């Protein structure tokens, strides 16, 4: 019929997300992480996408969350929505060496 809404529709609001990044000890921008649909799980730099539940760790001190979301989770709709299919495609294209 119609499909694909978020698994944890309680992390849909940016506020709810930066909420968790209060005790964030990492140089990976909390805001860009939250703004990218991410939220800390409570262990390490372990985050997830609120929509596609895509998990990410091992963040480099200067990674751009938006680039990572594309790469690891191309089929996220939230990503598609905020960034558009060219972005995702462009990211993946630059990757190629
Ligand atoms: C650099 N920028 C950061 C953001 C980054 O890229 N981080 C990477 C990362 O977090 N990734 C890579 C894609 C997946 C994601 C990890 N992930 N996925 N899901 N959750 C997570 S982390 C997490 C976990 C819990 C809560 C929140 C987050 C990565 C470096 O982090 C490590 C991790 C982990 C984990 C795991 C899942 O493992 C796979 C499912 C797989 N296991 C299987 O049973 C598969 C289905 N069977 C084939 C797996 O571990 N594999 C598959 C073949 C062998 C191994 C791959 N491998 N080889 N050597 N090391 C590895 S582990 C690995 C995983 C992804 C990329 C590279 C290496
Ligand atoms: Zn996602």
Residues 49 and 77 sit within 8 Å (Cβ to Cβ) = no
User: Which residue, among 2, 96, 9, 97, has the nearest Cα to 52 in the 3D structure?
Assistant: 9
Q: How far is CA 19 from the centre of its chain?
A: 15
The conformation of residue 23, written as its DSSP 8-state character, comes to: S
Residue of 20, 29, 57 best suited for mutating to test ligand 1, as the one with most atoms within 8 Å of CB: 57
Give the pocket of ligand 1 (CB within 6 Å): 41, 46, 48, 55-60, 63, 68, 72
Closest ligand by atom to 68 CA: 1
Enumerate the domain spans of the chain: 1-97
Distance CA 6, CA 20 (A): 18
Atom of ligand 1 nearest to the CA of 63: 2
Closest ligand by atom to 72 CA: 1
1-97 fold:
Inhibitor Of Apoptosis Protein (2mihbC-IAP-1); Chain A (1.10.1170)
């Amino acid at each position: 019929n119609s499909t694909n809404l978020p698994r944890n529709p309680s992390m849909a609001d940016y506020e709810a997300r930066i909420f968790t990044f209060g005790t964030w000890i990492y140089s990976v921008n909390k805001e860009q992480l939250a703004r990218a649909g991410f939220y800390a799980l409570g262990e390490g730099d372990k985050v997830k996408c609120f929509h596609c539940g895509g998990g990410l760790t091992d963040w480099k001190p200067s990674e751009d969350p938006w680039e990572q979301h594309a790469k690891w989770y191309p089929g996220c709709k939230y990503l598609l929505e905020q960034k558009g299919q060219e972005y995702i495609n462009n990211i993946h294209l630059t990757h190629s060496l």
